[PDB]
Structures are given as structure tokens and as C-alpha cells.
Amino acid sequence: DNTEIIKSFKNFILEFRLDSQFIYRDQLRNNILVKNYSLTVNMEHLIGYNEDIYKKLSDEPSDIIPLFETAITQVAKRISILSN
Amino acid sequence: VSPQQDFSDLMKSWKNERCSPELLPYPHQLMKRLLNRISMQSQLENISMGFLDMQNESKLPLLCMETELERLKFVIRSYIRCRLSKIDKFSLYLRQLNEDENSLISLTDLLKDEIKYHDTHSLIWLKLVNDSILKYMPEELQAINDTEGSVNMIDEPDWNKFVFIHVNGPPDGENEFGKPCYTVIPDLKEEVELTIGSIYVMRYEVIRDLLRDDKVAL
Amino acid sequence: NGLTNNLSHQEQEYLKEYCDLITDLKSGDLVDIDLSGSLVPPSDVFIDVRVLKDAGETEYGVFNLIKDSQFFVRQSDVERLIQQGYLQKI
Amino acid sequence: SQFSEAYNKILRNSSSHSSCQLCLNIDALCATKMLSLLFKKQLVQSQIVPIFGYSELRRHYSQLDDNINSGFGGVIDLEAFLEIDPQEQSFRRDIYVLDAHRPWNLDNIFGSQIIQCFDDGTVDDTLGEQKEAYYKLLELNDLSKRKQRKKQIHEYEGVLEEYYSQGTTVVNSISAQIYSLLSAIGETNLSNLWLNILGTTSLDIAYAQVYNRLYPLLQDEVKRLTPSSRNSVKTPDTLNIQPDYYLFLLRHSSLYDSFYYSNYVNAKLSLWNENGKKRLHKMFARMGIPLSTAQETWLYMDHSIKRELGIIFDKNLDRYGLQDIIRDGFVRTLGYRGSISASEFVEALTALLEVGNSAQKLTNLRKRWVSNFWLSWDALDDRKVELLNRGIQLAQDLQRAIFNTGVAILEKKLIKHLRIYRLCVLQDGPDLDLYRNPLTLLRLGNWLIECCAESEDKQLLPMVLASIDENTDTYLVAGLTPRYPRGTKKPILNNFSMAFQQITAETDAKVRIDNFESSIIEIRREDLSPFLEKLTLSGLL
Amino acid sequence: LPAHLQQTFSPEEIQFIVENEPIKIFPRITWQLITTDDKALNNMVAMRSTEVVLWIALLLKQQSKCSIVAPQWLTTKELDRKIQYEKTHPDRFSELPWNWLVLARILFNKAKDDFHDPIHELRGKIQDLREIRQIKVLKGLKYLNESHLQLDNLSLLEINELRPFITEIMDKLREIHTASL
């Protein structure tokens, strides 16, 4: 359901690991201290990640925009504690 | 006198050296015996040269030995070059400290290669500043030292500067008063104090006694 | 060292005396130091270096320096040749 | 001799203090990298020689060699080329000759000096002719038996004349035997195995031939190492078999451009001409694919189009006779950055070899060719992708220029359709700088050879090619051989080595055999014309 | 005159310091280095635990002559209890091996084969706990004034990189304050 998509993208930023380096959590850890309040994701890396996720984004964009906003803010709260 | 402890104290003194902002006693009593021991094992290469003679296997400790030799040699290189650098920056004041009676003179205890490089470098340095700017050497300006104002050649004996320190000291089995640990000291403020498990950064002056006593790591 | 012209002569005078003086200290140790170089701690023990415009060429054995030929060799001789810029990859 | 003991012997001769002391083919590079990696793992230092010049080797080996105790050479004897002159059983120095071409040089096997024959375990054969070329030849009423002996000597000499004078070609992939040998010792490295597969795929332009039965041999290795029984998802770190196709630049480019630049599809569909253009769109009309859909990158195309691709191919391409295409070729899994068939990576790396970089300028340029080799040797690592993508895209830039100049040649029809052999020359055209590399003309010639004759019966004929810009009519002319469309039917191989020896034995003014490969030679156009006349007659074939 | 840092130790220099660490191994064999401090020992029995300094183990591992045992303290469940203890301790920085950072970096280079599924498992944990430790440093770091600095428990690496900041600032504070008198 609803939260499974949030869980998929939290399992994307936290549980992606290429050869010896994880990249996206470092993107967000840099951007909060900078006071960015934003995040950039290369869609080609997303197609590189999974196959079902991309077709899901492909079908309904207006419905999947909030699951990104939720996955952004839930990780952002741990670093926000780390950072009202 | 144990090589294990000698090497331990080697890295120890190296760390202490690099952290300390100003000069420390020269350990010739130890530096010499080690410089000789390394030359002994260093020459001791001979088995490797004699190994080619048996030709009309395990070289692992061979190059390991050689490796540690040069490795330790690196350590001492940084150590000595660091001392030289410190002297270059402190040279005017250290000679002025040699001029004063009390307490401990520069000489050899606190400071041979060093004194040579010191005096020679300072010499040619004086020739370089002298021939360039002081020619052109006004009567009162002829002196290169504190006038006073402002100032010079008095820098930088600053013991007040903060630096990282780590409480470690020889156990009785003295100054351990409890409950958890030792010891009791700023001039205008009181004790905090200290514990062996945590680093407390504070003024380098109040801990100077302990460094002379070897009671606090850096 | 290792192992201009536009600047004022007094500097070169001081310079030549300085380098002569540091060679005097190199003569004193006889340790050996080798104190001006070997700044990075070694590991482990062998490295692969490529030639930088050196052909060339000798210490302990003559290795026949050849332009654009990369080797696999211990740090030792590399330390000397790098001072002349003759080696490139580290 | 057996490889194992020889290998142990070099190990015994390896470690020393002071140490030590001991271009185009990718097949050799794989074997070098795998063994090199083995010895670096054992920390065995040694020299690396990037040989370029066939005769330059004499200028270097004989120049600086002092303490030295220990694809080339199957033709030229180095004993004459160097003048080593046996000095003291237990000779002080040995030279390893790694070569896959046959027939072997006569001085190689017999008159063994540096060898240490590398023939094991490849060509036994027999090949019983060298036995009478040496055992009978050495040491070489009485008038009758003497004339009988001389007659038999000339008879065996006549037999031997056939041997060593014939076209040199590679027999089989060295990597196969080297991997078998390494696996005999027990080492199986996922990296190394994939590289073995890479080297085997590299020479596929020259069919398989044995490689067809060497498929199970690689498949066995795929069974002996099983990354996971089941996922084990993803895993973040780490090959697999897939239904591969001969189509070119599959994964990084549009299916449209893939056929557009496809060499195999080229002559059959006559892509240069306008007739087959609509036929190509007709193939897509059978595929039911929108033109705009074909232009999209392979990554963003719909999943349906993906899964149904092979069924659609099975249901459409057969109309044009393309039924034999789908193959079970291997595909590497590096996980997260995506899989690639060994063939494509090979094309990109070789493209990286050719781009991505008086007589002093030519030698300077030769030096630059060797300079580009190390960029390729560095490029062999998996992790260094940054440089690899540049070469991957430049491969497309080349193939674009290839097919373009190709159409230009198709309009003028400069081919002289002679009975002896076809002859051509490109004396002028745009973008001639790319033609300096022999490999450019190698694949270029191949791209023509399959185009002009599919076959297209009858009697496949060799093509002649040359080009020059400066340096006084260099006109590199490389030999070219016909390609059969699966219909090694015969041991034909090559012809030219003997002919080059016959014409180079004449007045040979300004001729330079400086090219390491026997098939290509530099010649003046002024003297190329009679060279052609002498080539036509007397025709050795 | 290297000039670098000169106050801080170089990261590779602290790596040179951690080289001194002894560790247990499982040699393939079933010597008498005269150099400095090993002094031990007779040829060891295969697959048997023996404590040896770090860099020699690195050598033997490069030749694959030893089987390194994984450090017992490094177990995911233990890091879980550490992170647990961290969420409930806003002030204390409790337990760290203190050299563990560089260890894990090195152990995952080669010793990775001996551990049981560390991949995509503890690596995340150490990173997570690392950053939460960093921010807890920042929360205690806002409190900084003379004369006390709470150094409590931290891996030496991070202490070294943060050194220039706090060290050079506090001096200014003390100077202006005492100087004002």
C-alpha cells in the first residue's frame, strides 16, 4: 500500500550501496547542514536501481509525488534532530 | 632499555614532540643508543649479500626487517626535521634564553646537530638581513632585538595556548584522591578536574609540570 | 633536493650557502637522513610506476630506463627518480 | 615441452635482488593480464615490453641488456635477427616467444636456442613434415647412392618449400589453454574467467571455429561457480548467459541506429541505397514499432517492448532471411551499473585503442600509437568507468564515419572487377587522418569485403586498399581476405606472404617492410603501379 | 619543512600510528626478526590463534599466509545495543574501540572474506552510528567556552580533523577575556 512506496524509497536511499560507497544519503546529509531544504536525484540512476519502481513512476506522476515528499521528510527528520 | 619499550617511547616522544608548541629536552642518552642499534641491524644486509654466493628462499622477514628499518627511520626523520623547524621559528628567543642564567641552558641536555644548524643558520640569516636591509642601518636601528615596542624577537614562549591533552599516569599498584580518579589548577579559576579515560583541552601552561613529569599525554 | 634568475642575487647567495649548509647536516647524519625527502610513510612495499620522459638510464642494478614503460617496483629507487620528475604514476 | 615445469623454472629464475631479469591483438592482452595478475599476487616483478616495430626489437634488445638471465616470432627467427650465437649447456639467457600463428618458423622448434617451445599443448599436430625437414636434413656404386641421396634431399626440400611459405593465421584462442592450465592449478577467478570469455569473443570476426565446441567448456565454468542459488537480492556486488544477437551497439544506442550502422545488415538490406531504406522501415512495420519509439534510448523504452522483443524478432526478421541470429552468448553481471555483452565492451576498448589518445614525424606518430596503448591497459579495469564511457561513445563516431565514406565509395564504383583479384585504391577523400591506423583499414576492408560480396555468387575475391597524405606517398596497402557467410569450409587462410617475399626480393626501391604485420606494407604510388603489375602477373594464386 | 599540517597529524600519519596495533591471526604454516619489538615466536601451528601487530598481518594477508580472525567486539547486535544506548544518552559518547574506523576500512578491504555476511549489514550500521555521533558532537560543541572541553569518547580520526577549529578559536576567547582585565 501507501506506505510501501515510502518504504521503497527509504530502502532506496538507505539501502543502496554501489562499490564501496553509498551516495544519496550523503547527498541529503550534505544538503541539510548547507540549509538546502532540497534534494536532487538522477532518474537514470533510478532506472539503474530497479525496474518495477520506474514503471510505477511512469504510470501516475500526480499520485507518486507525495510519497517522495514523505520519504524526503522522514529521513530529513533524523538529520533534523542531527541538525522546529 | 628494552627495545619494545624503547620503540614505544620512540613513537610516544614523536607524538609528544609534534603536539608540543615549543622545545623539549634533547634525549641524546636514548637517541644515541638507538642510532647505534639501528646501524648495527642495518649492517647486519650481510646475510643477503652472502646469500648470492651459494649459487654455483624465504625473504619475507628480510624485506620486513628492511621495511621496519626505513619505516622507523621515517619516524625519526619527521621527528628531527620537526625539531629543526621549531628551532628556526624560535631561534632568536632561544639564543636570548641561552643568554639568561636561569634555568636550564640550551646546550645539549635541552638541545648537537641542532646547535650547529641553529648558530650557522642564524649566522647566514644575519648576513642576509644585514646585507639587505641594515646598511641603511640607522644608529638606533642597529640592534636586532626587542626595543621595546612592538616588540620583537621575544616571540613566542606562549604556554597559555590551548592544546589537546590526555590524562595518563603511572599507577601506585600518590596524587589520586578519589572518588573516581586524579588529580586536582588555573590562576584565576579553579580545578575542573581530570579522569584517565577522557581528554580535557586546556591551557598548556598548567599541564607543563605534568609533561615534565610525563603525567599527561598529548 | 633531491637527492629563479629574476630573483635578487642576495637570495641566491643565501640560497647556495643554505643548501651547502643543509648538505653539511646531511653529511652529519650518517643516520641516514634523507631528512629533506621521504615525507610520506611507506606501504606496501612494492608500487607500479610509469616513466615520465626518461630514457635513460642504476642504483644497486642498472634497470635500463625506457620511455613510456611502466614497471612494478619497490618504493626505494622510485624515491630517487621521482626527485628528478622522471617517474609519473605512484 | 610441458608448461607446468617450465613455469616452475621461470619461478626459480624470477626472484632476485637486484631484480629480475626477464600491439593489436587483444587475445594476447587477456593472457598477459591474467598471468601478470597471478605473478603480482605472488609479487614477482618483471619487465613489460609494448612491442611495436618488427625490426625495432633488434634496436632495443641488442642495445641495453646486461644482467638479464631469462603474437610475434612465429615467422621471423630472432636468432638471426639478434645474432645469439650460443654461448655456454646451461645458457645464461632465455627469451619467451608467445605466438598463436601457424605454421611455426623452422628455427623455432628445431635449432632450439631461446625456446622453450610454446607449442604445448596446442599444435602436436602432426605436421610430420618438420621431422623430415630436420632429422633427414641433418647432417646431410657410391655415385648412384649419392645421386639418390641428393635427389631425395631436393625432394624433401621441395616438400619443405610448401611449409613456412603460406599465409600465417591464428589457429585457436590462447586464453582457453591458459585458463585450462590455470584451472589445473585450481585457481578460478570470476574476473579472469570473464576476461577469458572477452579474449575469445575478440577474435569472433574470424569465426569460431573450435570455439563452437569450446562453448560448453566455458559453460562448465559458469556451472562450477554459482554466485547465488536464488536471490540474494540484489546483491549490491555481482555473469549470465543471454540470447544475444549480432546487432551492433545494442545497449547504448537506438535499435534504429543499430541496424543503420549494422555491418551484417548492410549488404543484405543494401542500406547505402535507397531501395532497402523502405525495406528497413518495413521491418519495423512488421515489428509494429513507431519511428519515434525507435529513436528513444534503450533505457527508457517500455517493458512490454522489452520482453516482447525476441518474440517479435522471431515473428518478423525471418522474412528477410535473418533466421539464424539469436545466440546464447555470455553477459556479465556487475550489478548496479548494468550488464553488457562481452562483444560490445570489446568494440569499445578497441575503439579506445584507435582514438581517445622526414621519418621522425612518422616514428613520432608510431610513438603516439604506443602511448595510446597504456590508456587501454589502464582501461581494462572495471572500476575506472569514467574513461571507458568516452571510448564507448567515440566508437559510434567511428562507425558513423565508416558507413559514410562507405556510401561515397559505393557511388563511384571504383572497384576493378578483375578475375585474378579485385583491386581498389582510395587516392583522395574527406577525413583521411583516421585512415592512418592500419586497424581502421582492417575493419574498413572487412566492412567492404562483406558488403561487395555477401556472397553473391561466384568466386569471392580479395580486395586491394591504400591511402596516403604526406611523407612522400606512403600508401599503406593491407591485405584483405573474403568472408564466407556460413555456407572454414576449406583451409584457404591467406596467400600474400610468399608474393610479398617475391616482389620484395626484386629491385625494392623505397619499399619499407617496417609494418610488423606482414599483410600491410608502405609503397610509393609511382612504384605501386608496377608492384600491382607484378602482383597481377605472375599471380601466385 | 613539511609545513603540513603542522598542528594536525596527517590521516595517513595516524594510519601509520594505528599500524602498531596487535591482532590475532591463523597462519597457514605448521623467522627471528631482530628489528625492534616482536621478539616472538616459534613457527605457529596452522589455524591457531596468535596475536601479532597489524602491518605484519597485512603483509601475510597480502601473501595469504594467515587467516585473520574477526574482532569479537565487532558484531552487529553489539552495534545495535550501542545505537540503543546512543538514542537514550544525549550527552555520553560511551563506547568506541577508538581505532575502529580505520580498522573497518582495512578489514573490509581484505578480511571481508572471513566475516559472516557483513556486506550491506554492518557497514550501514557503522555509518549510521558514525553520523549520529558526529551530530552529538555538534550538540555538545555549541556549548564550547573556556576552560573546559568535554572530550569523553571518540575515535581519534575525527578528533584529529576537528582539531584546527576548536584549538584555534578557544585561544582567541581566552586572550580577549584575560586580556580585558
PDB file of N, CA and C in Angstrom, chain D residues 458-497:
ATOM      1  N   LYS D 458      29.577 -15.619 -58.116  1.00  0.00           N
ATOM      2  CA  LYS D 458      30.552 -16.608 -57.649  1.00  0.00           C
ATOM      3  C   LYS D 458      31.966 -16.078 -57.506  1.00  0.00           C
ATOM      4  N   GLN D 459      32.784 -16.905 -56.856  1.00  0.00           N
ATOM      5  CA  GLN D 459      34.219 -16.718 -56.690  1.00  0.00           C
ATOM      6  C   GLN D 459      34.610 -15.439 -55.971  1.00  0.00           C
ATOM      7  N   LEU D 460      34.487 -15.508 -54.655  1.00  0.00           N
ATOM      8  CA  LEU D 460      34.892 -14.467 -53.730  1.00  0.00           C
ATOM      9  C   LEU D 460      36.313 -14.020 -54.069  1.00  0.00           C
ATOM     10  N   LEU D 461      36.553 -12.712 -54.124  1.00  0.00           N
ATOM     11  CA  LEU D 461      37.896 -12.292 -54.498  1.00  0.00           C
ATOM     12  C   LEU D 461      38.481 -11.284 -53.522  1.00  0.00           C
ATOM     13  N   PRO D 462      39.806 -11.277 -53.371  1.00  0.00           N
ATOM     14  CA  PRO D 462      40.454 -10.316 -52.473  1.00  0.00           C
ATOM     15  C   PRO D 462      40.407  -8.891 -52.979  1.00  0.00           C
ATOM     16  N   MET D 463      40.362  -7.972 -52.026  1.00  0.00           N
ATOM     17  CA  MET D 463      40.283  -6.548 -52.275  1.00  0.00           C
ATOM     18  C   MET D 463      41.621  -5.892 -51.963  1.00  0.00           C
ATOM     19  N   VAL D 464      41.953  -4.861 -52.717  1.00  0.00           N
ATOM     20  CA  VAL D 464      43.166  -4.079 -52.514  1.00  0.00           C
ATOM     21  C   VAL D 464      42.761  -2.717 -51.975  1.00  0.00           C
ATOM     22  N   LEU D 465      43.523  -2.172 -51.019  1.00  0.00           N
ATOM     23  CA  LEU D 465      43.221  -0.854 -50.471  1.00  0.00           C
ATOM     24  C   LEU D 465      44.463  -0.100 -50.031  1.00  0.00           C
ATOM     25  N   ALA D 466      44.442   1.223 -50.239  1.00  0.00           N
ATOM     26  CA  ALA D 466      45.534   2.115 -49.853  1.00  0.00           C
ATOM     27  C   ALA D 466      45.088   3.569 -49.762  1.00  0.00           C
ATOM     28  N   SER D 467      45.872   4.352 -49.010  1.00  0.00           N
ATOM     29  CA  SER D 467      45.670   5.786 -48.842  1.00  0.00           C
ATOM     30  C   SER D 467      46.964   6.435 -48.369  1.00  0.00           C
ATOM     31  N   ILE D 468      47.149   7.712 -48.712  1.00  0.00           N
ATOM     32  CA  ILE D 468      48.335   8.464 -48.297  1.00  0.00           C
ATOM     33  C   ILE D 468      48.020   9.947 -48.308  1.00  0.00           C
ATOM     34  N   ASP D 469      48.669  10.692 -47.413  1.00  0.00           N
ATOM     35  CA  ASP D 469      48.514  12.143 -47.332  1.00  0.00           C
ATOM     36  C   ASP D 469      49.841  12.864 -47.492  1.00  0.00           C
ATOM     37  N   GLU D 470      50.820  12.555 -46.655  1.00  0.00           N
ATOM     38  CA  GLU D 470      52.115  13.203 -46.677  1.00  0.00           C
ATOM     39  C   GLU D 470      53.155  12.107 -46.533  1.00  0.00           C
ATOM     40  N   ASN D 471      54.387  12.524 -46.258  1.00  0.00           N
ATOM     41  CA  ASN D 471      55.536  11.644 -46.079  1.00  0.00           C
ATOM     42  C   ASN D 471      55.887  10.908 -47.356  1.00  0.00           C
ATOM     43  N   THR D 472      55.658  11.581 -48.483  1.00  0.00           N
ATOM     44  CA  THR D 472      56.007  11.140 -49.832  1.00  0.00           C
ATOM     45  C   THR D 472      55.384   9.802 -50.225  1.00  0.00           C
ATOM     46  N   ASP D 473      54.057   9.805 -50.394  1.00  0.00           N
ATOM     47  CA  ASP D 473      53.306   8.650 -50.910  1.00  0.00           C
ATOM     48  C   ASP D 473      53.523   7.356 -50.119  1.00  0.00           C
ATOM     49  N   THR D 474      53.156   7.392 -48.836  1.00  0.00           N
ATOM     50  CA  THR D 474      53.335   6.211 -48.000  1.00  0.00           C
ATOM     51  C   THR D 474      52.498   5.049 -48.496  1.00  0.00           C
ATOM     52  N   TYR D 475      51.228   5.321 -48.800  1.00  0.00           N
ATOM     53  CA  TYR D 475      50.216   4.415 -49.334  1.00  0.00           C
ATOM     54  C   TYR D 475      50.214   3.040 -48.700  1.00  0.00           C
ATOM     55  N   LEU D 476      49.860   2.955 -47.424  1.00  0.00           N
ATOM     56  CA  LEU D 476      49.803   1.669 -46.751  1.00  0.00           C
ATOM     57  C   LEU D 476      48.813   0.768 -47.461  1.00  0.00           C
ATOM     58  N   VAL D 477      49.262  -0.411 -47.851  1.00  0.00           N
ATOM     59  CA  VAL D 477      48.405  -1.344 -48.554  1.00  0.00           C
ATOM     60  C   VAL D 477      48.337  -2.585 -47.712  1.00  0.00           C
ATOM     61  N   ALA D 478      47.171  -2.867 -47.179  1.00  0.00           N
ATOM     62  CA  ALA D 478      47.000  -4.023 -46.329  1.00  0.00           C
ATOM     63  C   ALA D 478      46.223  -5.107 -47.049  1.00  0.00           C
ATOM     64  N   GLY D 479      46.667  -6.346 -46.853  1.00  0.00           N
ATOM     65  CA  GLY D 479      45.988  -7.465 -47.459  1.00  0.00           C
ATOM     66  C   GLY D 479      44.602  -7.645 -46.878  1.00  0.00           C
ATOM     67  N   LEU D 480      43.710  -8.207 -47.681  1.00  0.00           N
ATOM     68  CA  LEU D 480      42.329  -8.405 -47.283  1.00  0.00           C
ATOM     69  C   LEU D 480      41.860  -9.744 -47.816  1.00  0.00           C
ATOM     70  N   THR D 481      41.044 -10.446 -47.034  1.00  0.00           N
ATOM     71  CA  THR D 481      40.577 -11.766 -47.431  1.00  0.00           C
ATOM     72  C   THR D 481      39.059 -11.896 -47.366  1.00  0.00           C
ATOM     73  N   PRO D 482      38.456 -12.652 -48.291  1.00  0.00           N
ATOM     74  CA  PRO D 482      36.992 -12.820 -48.308  1.00  0.00           C
ATOM     75  C   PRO D 482      36.401 -13.506 -47.080  1.00  0.00           C
ATOM     76  N   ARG D 483      35.170 -13.112 -46.731  1.00  0.00           N
ATOM     77  CA  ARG D 483      34.449 -13.657 -45.584  1.00  0.00           C
ATOM     78  C   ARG D 483      33.290 -14.537 -46.062  1.00  0.00           C
ATOM     79  N   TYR D 484      33.274 -15.850 -45.653  1.00  0.00           N
ATOM     80  CA  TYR D 484      32.133 -16.685 -46.057  1.00  0.00           C
ATOM     81  C   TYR D 484      30.922 -16.501 -45.137  1.00  0.00           C
ATOM     82  N   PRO D 485      29.697 -16.461 -45.678  1.00  0.00           N
ATOM     83  CA  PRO D 485      28.509 -16.361 -44.807  1.00  0.00           C
ATOM     84  C   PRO D 485      27.963 -17.707 -44.325  1.00  0.00           C
ATOM     85  N   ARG D 486      28.817 -18.541 -43.715  1.00  0.00           N
ATOM     86  CA  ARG D 486      28.425 -19.859 -43.155  1.00  0.00           C
ATOM     87  C   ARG D 486      27.820 -20.793 -44.202  1.00  0.00           C
ATOM     88  N   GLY D 487      28.356 -20.750 -45.413  1.00  0.00           N
ATOM     89  CA  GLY D 487      27.865 -21.587 -46.488  1.00  0.00           C
ATOM     90  C   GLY D 487      28.902 -21.840 -47.565  1.00  0.00           C
ATOM     91  N   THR D 488      34.882 -22.188 -41.839  1.00  0.00           N
ATOM     92  CA  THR D 488      36.052 -22.707 -42.528  1.00  0.00           C
ATOM     93  C   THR D 488      35.619 -23.878 -43.381  1.00  0.00           C
ATOM     94  N   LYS D 489      35.069 -23.590 -44.564  1.00  0.00           N
ATOM     95  CA  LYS D 489      34.675 -24.697 -45.417  1.00  0.00           C
ATOM     96  C   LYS D 489      35.924 -25.407 -45.905  1.00  0.00           C
ATOM     97  N   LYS D 490      36.971 -24.635 -46.200  1.00  0.00           N
ATOM     98  CA  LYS D 490      38.268 -25.109 -46.648  1.00  0.00           C
ATOM     99  C   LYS D 490      39.384 -24.356 -45.933  1.00  0.00           C
ATOM    100  N   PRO D 491      40.551 -24.990 -45.768  1.00  0.00           N
ATOM    101  CA  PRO D 491      41.718 -24.342 -45.136  1.00  0.00           C
ATOM    102  C   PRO D 491      42.380 -23.186 -45.900  1.00  0.00           C
ATOM    103  N   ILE D 492      41.672 -22.433 -46.752  1.00  0.00           N
ATOM    104  CA  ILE D 492      42.211 -21.326 -47.560  1.00  0.00           C
ATOM    105  C   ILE D 492      43.203 -20.340 -46.916  1.00  0.00           C
ATOM    106  N   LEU D 493      42.887 -19.839 -45.731  1.00  0.00           N
ATOM    107  CA  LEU D 493      43.636 -18.901 -44.903  1.00  0.00           C
ATOM    108  C   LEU D 493      44.121 -17.587 -45.534  1.00  0.00           C
ATOM    109  N   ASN D 494      45.301 -17.577 -46.176  1.00  0.00           N
ATOM    110  CA  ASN D 494      45.890 -16.398 -46.835  1.00  0.00           C
ATOM    111  C   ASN D 494      46.720 -16.823 -48.037  1.00  0.00           C
ATOM    112  N   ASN D 495      47.230 -15.820 -48.756  1.00  0.00           N
ATOM    113  CA  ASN D 495      48.075 -16.028 -49.925  1.00  0.00           C
ATOM    114  C   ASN D 495      49.369 -15.213 -49.940  1.00  0.00           C
ATOM    115  N   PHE D 496      49.229 -13.899 -49.762  1.00  0.00           N
ATOM    116  CA  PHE D 496      50.263 -12.862 -49.849  1.00  0.00           C
ATOM    117  C   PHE D 496      51.671 -12.916 -49.285  1.00  0.00           C
ATOM    118  N   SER D 497      51.944 -13.657 -48.207  1.00  0.00           N
ATOM    119  CA  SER D 497      53.299 -13.673 -47.644  1.00  0.00           C
ATOM    120  C   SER D 497      54.360 -14.079 -48.657  1.00  0.00           C
TER     121      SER D 497
END
